[PDB]
Paper text:
We determined the structure at 3.1 Å resolution of an autoinhibited state by cryo-electron microscopy (cryo-EM). To stabilize the complex in the autoinhibited E2P conformation (E2Pautoinhibited), the sample was incubated in the presence of beryllium fluoride (forming e.g. BeF3-, BeF2(OH2) adducts, referred to as BeFx) mimicking phosphorylation. Comparison with other P4-ATPase structures and the presence of an extra density in the phosphorylation site confirmed that our structure resembles an E2Pautoinhibited state with bound BeFx. The transmembrane domain of CDC50A is made of two interacting transmembrane α-helices and three N-linked glycosylation sites are clearly visible in the cryo-EM map (N107, N180, and N294), indicating that S. cerevisiae supports glycosylation of this human transporter. Interestingly, the N-terminal region (Q16-D27) was found to interact tightly with the P-, A- and the N-domain of ATP8B1. Similarly, the C-terminal tail of ATP8B1 engages in hydrogen bonds as well as several salt bridges and hydrophobic interactions with the three cytosolic domains. Noteworthily, F1211 in the conserved AYAFS motif interacts via π-π interactions with F596 in the N-domain, which normally interacts with the adenosine ring of ATP in P-type ATPases, thereby preventing ATP binding. We find that ATP8B1 is autoinhibited by its N- and C-terminal tails, which form extensive interactions with the catalytic sites and flexible domain interfaces. Intriguingly, despite addition of PI(3,4,5)P3 during sample preparation for cryo-EM studies, no clear density could be observed for this lipid. The structure of ATP8B1 presented in this report is locked in a E2Pautoinhibited state where the exoplasmic lipid pathway is closed.
Residue numbers in the entry:
A (entry chain A): 16 to 27, 63 to 71, 106 to 773, 787 to 813, 833 to 1228
B (entry chain B): 25 to 351
The structure:
Amino acid sequence: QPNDEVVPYSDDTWQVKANDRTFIPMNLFEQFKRAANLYFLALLILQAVPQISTLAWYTTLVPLLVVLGVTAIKDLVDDVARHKMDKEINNRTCEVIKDGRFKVAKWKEIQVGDVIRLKKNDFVPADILLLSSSEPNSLCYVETAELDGETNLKFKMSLEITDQYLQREDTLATFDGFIECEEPNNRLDKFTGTLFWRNTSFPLDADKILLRGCVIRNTDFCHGLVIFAGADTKIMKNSGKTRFKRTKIDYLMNYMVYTIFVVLILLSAGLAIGHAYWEAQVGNSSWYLYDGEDDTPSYRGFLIFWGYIIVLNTMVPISLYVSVEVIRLGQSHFINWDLQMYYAEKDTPAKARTTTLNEQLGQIHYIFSDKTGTLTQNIMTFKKCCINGQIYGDHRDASQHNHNKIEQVDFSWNTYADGKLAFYDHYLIEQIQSGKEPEVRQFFFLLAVCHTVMVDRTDGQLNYQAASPDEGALVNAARNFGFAFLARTQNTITISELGTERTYNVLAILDFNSDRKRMSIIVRTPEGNIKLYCKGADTVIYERLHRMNPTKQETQDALDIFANETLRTLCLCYKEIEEKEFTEWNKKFMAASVASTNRDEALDKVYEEIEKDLILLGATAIEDKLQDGVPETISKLAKADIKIWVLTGDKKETAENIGFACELLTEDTTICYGEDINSLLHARMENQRQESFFPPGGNRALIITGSWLNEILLEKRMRTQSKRRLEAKKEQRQKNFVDLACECSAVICCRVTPKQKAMVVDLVKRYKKAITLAIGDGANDVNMIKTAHIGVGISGQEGMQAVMSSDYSFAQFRYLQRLLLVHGRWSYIRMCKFLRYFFYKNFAFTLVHFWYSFFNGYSAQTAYEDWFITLYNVLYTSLPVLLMGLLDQDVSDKLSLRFPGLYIVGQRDLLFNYKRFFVSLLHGVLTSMILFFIPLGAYLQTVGQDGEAPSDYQSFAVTIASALVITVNFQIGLDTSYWTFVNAFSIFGSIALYFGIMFDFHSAGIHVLFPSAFQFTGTASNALRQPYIWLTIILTVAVCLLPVVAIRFLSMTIWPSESDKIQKHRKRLKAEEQWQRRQQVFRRGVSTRRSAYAFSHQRGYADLISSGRSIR
Amino acid sequence: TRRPDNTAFKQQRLPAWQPILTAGTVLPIFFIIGLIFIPIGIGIFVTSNNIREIEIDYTGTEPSSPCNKCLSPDVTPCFCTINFTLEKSFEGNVFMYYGLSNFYQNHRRYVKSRDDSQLNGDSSALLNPSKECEPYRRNEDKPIAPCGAIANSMFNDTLELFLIGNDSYPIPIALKKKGIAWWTDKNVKFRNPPGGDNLEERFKGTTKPVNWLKPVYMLDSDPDNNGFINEDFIVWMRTAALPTFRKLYRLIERKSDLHPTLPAGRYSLNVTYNYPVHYFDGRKRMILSTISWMGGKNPFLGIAYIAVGSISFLLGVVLLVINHKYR
Ligand SMILES: *[C@@H]1O[C@H](CO)[C@@H](O[C@@H]2O[C@H](CO)[C@@H](O[C@@H]3O[C@H](CO)[C@@H](O)[C@H](O)[C@@H]3O)[C@H](O)[C@H]2NC(C)=O)[C@H](O)[C@H]1NC(C)=O
Ligand SMILES: CC(C)CCC[C@@H](C)[C@H]1CC[C@H]2[C@@H]3CC=C4C[C@@H](OC(=O)CCC(=O)O)CC[C@]4(C)[C@H]3CC[C@]12C
Ligand SMILES: CC(C)CCC[C@@H](C)[C@H]1CC[C@H]2[C@@H]3CC=C4C[C@@H](OC(=O)CCC(=O)O)CC[C@]4(C)[C@H]3CC[C@]12C
Ligand SMILES: CC(C)CCC[C@@H](C)[C@H]1CC[C@H]2[C@@H]3CC=C4C[C@@H](OC(=O)CCC(=O)O)CC[C@]4(C)[C@H]3CC[C@]12C
Ligand SMILES: CC(C)CCC[C@@H](C)[C@H]1CC[C@H]2[C@@H]3CC=C4C[C@@H](OC(=O)CCC(=O)O)CC[C@]4(C)[C@H]3CC[C@]12C
Ligand SMILES: *[C@@H]1O[C@H](CO)[C@@H](O)[C@H](O)[C@H]1NC(C)=O
Ligand SMILES: *[C@@H]1O[C@H](CO)[C@@H](O)[C@H](O)[C@H]1NC(C)=O
Ligand code: BEF
Ligand SMILES: [Mg+2]
């Protein structure tokens, strides 16, 4: 039932008349979406009240205004960049009839029901009803490599009525026809409608409609009428819904912030009960703490709950999000500026068009890639051949092999030859020239006859217009070897054999279709002989070979070798027909060529009747070129424990051939097709009516067609019970399929529609909880680019459909090596370091108030200056962490591509779990403990007790602040492993700036200006000149920093990580063997172990050529 | 679309240093820290041990002391006397402090009860004081010049020292009451109201704090040590950091003669008990200390330095052993 040759669009009235056509919202968004801003505004409101305020109103605004300004500036820059990208990538134009004659107009000025004209190689703007063309019978050839991964050219024809009357712009301008068609939908194969014109109705069909992604080729100009437009086009309805993408670390940060909220609430409540009890016991007896307010101890505790909330608010950071955004912006700009990710030929630098998904590049689990245009260059060439059992094409010189370093044979002797074909083999040239072996020339004569291509000689250059890449390559190879296909007509071909022009007489063309798998042609030679030449798949041709064929085994060996080299193989045969047999078969064929009721079956039977006894000639090998460094990239990403799946819309033969050519599949791998997977799943379901589907030690791969993918996933009141049971069964089947697929080495999906690509990506994401990436080009890959966690579009080509909705846009698949193994890994490491240090240094600063609470009656008295609290998070501990988060590397990029195994560190969430958060919190708690309790012990006794004795509250505050700043700015230095000059400058300049600003505030002039604001006048000058104060500061710093150094050293020495081992031995590393293809896997025992047949062509062209439709 | 600039910053290649924490790079800092902390701790401890300090507690809370009668002073002037001895004579300048224990001067409700504008000598603030010192802002109908709870709760106690000589006649000891406050505090932070030459007319329309026996006028007879610049007032206004604190009271200057400043013998302390602290388990002490040429008597820093040096040396040894065992 399932079909391997059709994409399953099914399993997934409109009326047209012709010629009858900035800062406030960002602030609100950040306030509401980000609960931190609302929290800080609530803190401000609390600080307004005088009965509860414990800190001035400066504290929460001075930083908050800076946060708001920075966020607004970044948002404005991002908006400007987005508007730019949009403006400078949306430059496309087309000719339209909006006035007396044609006018140029952008694609946005198109209205449903307006006639337009297109030229060669011009992307179709919207769905069109082809009205006329320069080609005979108004034919038009379109390439749909981006609507689906098919590299062959389809043909569209228009109505006879519109063909013979709309050949001129004069009639098009006055054209007035009605169209009633189906409403817009996502079905690209069929189209039902009707055109009313000249008081008559004409039905429409898909063979008259050009879609948006089509590219017009082999047609000078084409006039049509727009049917759909904008988002209503059949390819725009296949684009998923854009969603807001958030990294895996954002949710962790949210849970972290909620935990900090809870901890702050608990601490405030505890200190509130503490103060209530203290006031009950000691507060009333104290005759000096009289405020004249009749407040009971419980009321005081309740009132100071809010005071302690205000004091400890700084536990939740105020500059976390701005720091994260700046880090991500800098890393994205690093991605943009990368010079290794620069394609010189197309001049297409990389691009990070979303500046919020950076660390997630270091956590990728799966990659899903298109095939046509992503892993391939859309170029294929004729590499080798086998004639009479001799394999030609391997390196040789003269008539005997001499050396590998041989030159390129010159085709000067030929007249039509050019430089397209790069062939390094001389024995073939001598064999052809000598003529001692006529079958050598017969081989290329067959190559130049059996095709169905067209020839254009407008400039006399003999240009070949081929609807199949394989046919084009073979015809070019034949032409270069002296057999050039010059001209064709209804009943003749005019091949020129070694300079002699012989005009044959074509008698019949036996067409190609997926089931037949072969093509043939019966022609009469000028002498009078009748010969049938056929070429096709080896499997379907080895069942029709004559009894006598000495070269059968040698050609079989050649086919095996070609399949071993990952090449597309075809088998060639010919036979001679007698006059009587030919006339009887011609009678039968003409009988079957008129019965249009069941023409296909009668034609197939007639075709089968003649191709019975065939004499072999050899085989041909066509290599489909891949992008440079594709197999190397795949192997590297496999060493990093990343699984690559290929989701292509191309036929099965091409997908399997590319899978073998990319080294995804090998001789060891056992391939399972749709039916085997379906049987396995059925058996498992019956058993269930866990254990691995396959033995662990085996190697396997999956080749699933779209129809079989739908079949195996079941996608082909009592009603509620039925619905729920069916949904449960579908969920179980989907989980089973996902588990089976993730157990195999490689998975390839072919003949899949965009919805199916999105379905597979979503299934993996959901049932495996894995981070997924999607890379591809064209319009069919947009849905999986919008569904995956990260989406990459291959730019550089004229198709900018997948790049619009992508996240990162480079020009070649190779650069994926540096996106993940350098940029993503570094980004993950840097973000984790930033978060750890940030939470450490924010918790080490606010717990001093908690510790001090025990020595001031739990009265919410700050241990820091009223202005130090303001500038701590902005000036003293802001720059160094950002610099470390922008300019930190553990190993060099050249040493990070050489050891992909490092990636796993981010792949398992090891550098920052939900456990490292509490470790950092404990570190901050201990640091604050020491910072407070060492100065306290120093201050209990004498500290420089004389006339100038700094033993008061302000000296205490400045001592603790200095110790805190030094300790934090030395911890940041301990964290960094890439000591750029700017890193050291910031680390040693934050402390200097703190000291300078402190000495500025503690100045006579500022106090004279207004004394209320500043109370710490003269404390710094008279407190930092005592040796005991400096000894206390040094002791605090040493106690805070020594255990960290000891623990880091012990961890590195006993449990070193991969980066440590690489860095220790970095000096002795010199062995780096470049990846090399596995040269030889030749074996014996089986005549054939795989059929490497592959051909891309569509049925119908022979019908056009046999009739006069395709002849001008 | 064009070729990105080739620069050190843009291409993620900036000249940098790669500090691997090699086993030969962390042991040296441990050993250096130990060897530099041990001698400093020894020196600080030795200096602290060589300081002669005498602390006399005269709160009179516990009976059988010759000051308990002042816990219920029916008569406002209550006088005690404390007899003590100095075994070893002091030398050089001597400092006399009054200390309070269990006296929370770091309370938030207490630290903010202040008006730095009025104490700066501002005519506008001299009347209509700041709202922060509300409980002691106005007495009946006029502003209180030193408003706030800090000014009212000021040490009300006079202390004097006498030496019992061989003649059985107490010998008074001169006590200097100047130069016991920060220079900036006396010359910048605190200043008298502007205008006039007589302090009497300067504070016109302002009463005294409700607790002060006499107004700001009679704090001192000298015109350079009365007003808001009084040093006994500045010293108190400088709030302490912990419940227990010592505030400088008097300076005893070394006599130019070779004899000790405080010759060893017997001494009597003459305290006028006026400041009550027994309600909330507070304590009052008088401390006589001598000058050091490194700070003062701080055994805590010396002991901590000794301990940290020893621990650093032990950690260095242990880390060396671990490095050898897992080399
Ligand atoms: C400061 O010295 C004075 C005496 O030398 C003592 O403090 C306070 O002294 C005043 C009297 O000068 C007491 O006045 C109170 O006044 C109200 C009415 O105005 C009256 O109802 C009270 O019963 C009392 O008479 C004040 O209570 C007293 N402060 C106390 C007892 O805490 C004390 O020696 C030193 N105290 C301070 C805070 O400086
Ligand atoms: C929720 C977890 C993480 C605990 C975090 C908060 C604690 C720091 C709070 C909770 C209960 C609080 C205690 C509740 C009651 C008191 C009685 C309070 O009153 C007194 O005993 C002193 C009065 C006097 O000295 O006469 C002393 C502080 C204390 C122990 C509090 C100290 C701070 C505590 C331990
Ligand atoms: C990290 C490991 C190696 C040591 C963990 C020990 C800590 C749990 C100890 C060390 C210092 C201790 C603190 C030392 C002093 C105090 C003050 C104490 O209160 C008082 O002494 C009275 C306060 C007053 O005078 O009003 C309450 C317990 C507390 C916070 C202690 C809590 C427990 C601490 C943090
Ligand atoms: C290796 C590090 C990471 C572990 C944590 C070390 C703590 C256990 C240390 C750091 C600060 C030390 C405190 C520093 C100061 C003091 C004050 C000290 O009290 C006095 O000096 C006066 C004693 C008195 O006169 O009553 C009592 C020990 C204590 C709490 C220390 C207890 C031990 C502490 C908490
Ligand atoms: C360097 C890292 C790896 C270890 C950090 C731990 C130190 C902070 C601990 C270890 C020993 C502790 C000391 C142990 C003993 C004392 C004596 C103690 O003083 C007393 O109470 C005794 C009476 C007197 O001071 O004379 C004051 C705390 C102190 C200095 C402790 C301060 C904190 C110290 C240095
Ligand atoms: C101190 O000693 C003298 C010696 O006569 C005595 O009169 C006085 O009462 C004593 N004071 C005390 C013990 O407080
Ligand atoms: C000083 O002590 C003596 C003890 O007799 C006595 O004069 C009085 O108690 C004190 N001085 C004054 C002025 O009260
Ligand atoms: F471009 Be893919 F092969 F659909
Ligand atoms: Mg593609």
